[PDB]
Structures are given as C-alpha cells and as structure tokens.
Design a binder for this molecule. Structure first.
Ligand SMILES: [Cl-]
Ligand SMILES: [Mg+2]
Ligand SMILES: [Mg+2]
Ligand SMILES: [Mg+2]
Ligand SMILES: [Mg+2]
Ligand SMILES: [Mg+2]
Ligand SMILES: [Mg+2]
Length: 327
DNA sequence: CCGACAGGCGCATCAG
DNA sequence: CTGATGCGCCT
DNA sequence: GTCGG
C-alpha cells in the first residue's frame, strides 16, 4: 500500500503506545517524527543504518527497523498486543473525550469494553457520552464529495446570518485530500479583530443557525472562539442516513486570518515542524501571530503579515502550497 | 552529555 | 467566587 | 526517542 508502510505502521503503533499507555508525550512525538520522515523517504529502506541517516531516526529506531526487516515483526509490539491492560487502555482512547488518563482509570475500575462503557454512561462526561453515542460513525472517513456538500451548507447558512462572515474549510480538505477525518471551519467577521470585538455572540449566531437547519446535531464544547461538535448531512426519502460527523469551528480575528489559516490547514506534524523551525530561527508562531524571540525568551511584538507566504519568508522557508503540507 | 521538544481553547477539578 | 492546573482536544 | 549546542 505504501513504500515503507510496514516500518511506518510499526512506528505509529509505538507512538500510540507511548501516548496512550506510557503517557510519554515526547516519545509519542519522537516516534511520529520518525514515521513522518520515513514516509516521505523515496527509497525502500534496506537497513536500519540507512534509516538512521534521516533526521528524527536514531539508534533505537534503527535497531527496531533492523528487527522488523529481518523478521517481519517487532517483539516489543507483539508483547504489547497481548497485554490486556495496554490493549484495553488503547481501545478506550478511541472514544472521543477519553484520553490516556481517563482510559487507565476506567480500565482500573473494570471498564474495558464498548459494552462496559454503554452500561456506565453516568460515569462519562458530556463529551465522552457523545463520543460513545457516535463511536462507529466517528471512525468513518468523509469522502471529499460529502465534504463539498457540507461546505455548501455551512457557507450558505453563514451567509444567511451575515454576508460579512467569511467561512473557510481548512484541514485535510484545504490540502486537497480525497477524504477527511472531520470538518474544520475557520470563521472571520469584520467586527472581531485583534483590536476590538464590536459585536458579541459572533460564533454563537452561526452555531445557532446551523442547529436550526438540523446540520449541527450535538455540542461537545463551545466558547467564544471555538466550537467542537457533531453535524450530519441531510438524507433523501428511503435513504439510509449519513454518518454523524465531527465538526470544529474556530473564530479568528479578521486581521490575523493568515496565521489562522496556516494553523488550521496543518497538517499537525507540519505545524509542529514549522513552529519548531521558527523557534530555531528566533521566532514563535501561533494561530494569531508570528513574533520575534529576544535573548530572554519573551516574545516581542507581532510582525506584519498579509499572506501565508510572509510567515514562511520570516523563517526563511520556501513556500509550500497546502497540498504539500500533508503527511 | 543534556535541555528542549508547538501552541493554545474549553472543560473539569482543586485550594482558598 | 478566583486563579492555577492538567486533561483532551484541534491543526 | 532524538539531536544540536
Ligand atoms: Cl468573541
Ligand atoms: Mg479519545
Ligand atoms: Mg486530525
Ligand atoms: Mg480535519
Ligand atoms: Mg478537526
Ligand atoms: Mg436521524
Ligand atoms: Mg499541550
């Protein structure tokens, strides 16, 4: 299916173990870094020493790669796969709203199956309850055809609330992916800038309208600038319903759109790589601004930005189109 | 050898 | 009630 | 787990 798929699968599985079971986030990310650089490597890897030349692959992963190439498996992962506790904790984290901490606690309390979760909903917070309700649906991917229908609904309903809003579908969709895990919507309005909020309830307005027309069905979390919830396309007579889908909406100051869209377009690993490179170059990037770093570590004042490319220029990177920011 | 590893929103919890 | 903390999440 | 001072 992919060039070094066995190796990248192995490393991703180790990343998940370190995140979900070990609760070691830097090992998680180190494994993800290695998987990422390897996935982009345009040769079929013949040895661990060859892999070790790539940035992010060290002695330990090279050693694992040699085992995998020689035997087709990793004894370390075979052990983890048979460990009941590890498997159960891993499984529970697949429910949206259950992370490593909550999964371990549930598993300690004897709760380790979908059945167990369902007969213990009173032990779940709101988010987790909705994640359980739509467990199967949330692991389905969204065909780009459906993303396009969803975009049409969101853009048209936003326009009905106020023609001044601009809604931009970001994430994997903006990177040209033929399928997406969920929908990410960046929202701006003239009355919300970094200098003032001249109208309240800007995000609420939009969420309310999408609820009215039955597009948004559930709310996981909702503040002044970020909505996390569930939506569903309308189905026609006699047709099975579409799966429920995860949707995220982020209201960003209009004058900080470019940092906002850079953030929201990702990928996640791309953002981590780009932000880490910015730090190396003496800058810090968030979804709002790019700022210089002084000697002390105090971030300076936001630099002027009027394109995505400007952010790349500051850190001396050649521009990468959204399509080339994917894993 | 070892300090740093991206950055931040919303929620739930804790001390006072 | 604040204010601080950490979880789980987003890209 | 990795790597640049
Ligand atoms: Cl606001
Ligand atoms: Mg989860
Ligand atoms: Mg994602
Ligand atoms: Mg997405
Ligand atoms: Mg999302
Ligand atoms: Mg229905
Ligand atoms: Mg964090």
């Amino acid at each position: 299916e992919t060039l070094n798929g066995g190796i990248t699968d192995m490393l991703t599985e180790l990343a998940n173990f370190e995140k979900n079971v070990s609760q070691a986030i830097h090992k998680y990310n180190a494994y993800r870094k290695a998987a990422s650089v390897i996935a982009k490597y345009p040769h079929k890897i013949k040895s661990g020493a060859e892999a070790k030349k790539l940035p992010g692959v060290g002695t330990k992963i090279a050693e694992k790669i040699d085992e995998f190439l020689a035997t087709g498996k990793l004894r370390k992962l075979e052990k983890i796969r048979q460990d009941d506790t590890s498997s159960s904790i891993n499984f529970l984290t697949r429910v949206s709203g259950i992370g490593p901490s909550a999964a371990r606690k549930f598993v300690d309390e004897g709760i380790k199956t979908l059945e167990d979760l369902r007969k213990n909903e009173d032990k779940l917070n709101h988010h987790q309850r909705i994640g359980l309700k739509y467990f199967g649906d949330f692991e389905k991917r969204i065909p780009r055809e459906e993303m396009l229908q969803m975009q049409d609904i969101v853009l048209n309903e936003v326009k009905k609330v106020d023609s001044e809003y601009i809604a931009t579908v970001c994430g994997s969709f903006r990177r040209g992916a033929e399928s997406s895990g969920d929908m990410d919507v960046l929202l701006t309005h003239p009355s919300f800038t970094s200098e003032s909020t001249k109208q309240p309830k800007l995000l609420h307005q939009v969420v309310e309208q999408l609820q009215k027309v039955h597009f948004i069905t559930d709310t996981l979390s909702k503040g002044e600038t970020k909505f996390m919830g569930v939506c569903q396309l309308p189905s026609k007579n006699d047709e099975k319903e579409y799966p429920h889908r995860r949707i995220d909406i982020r209201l960003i100051p209009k004058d900080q759109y470019y940092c906002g869209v850079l953030y929201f377009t990702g990928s996640d690993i791309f953002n981590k790589n780009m932000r880490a490179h910015a730090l190396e170059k003496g800058f810090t990037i968030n979804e709002y601004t790019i700022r210089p770093l002084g000697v002390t570590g105090v971030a300076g004042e936001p630099l002027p930005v009027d394109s995505e490319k400007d952010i790349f220029d500051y850190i001396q990177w050649k521009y990468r189109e959204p399509k080339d920011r994917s894993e």
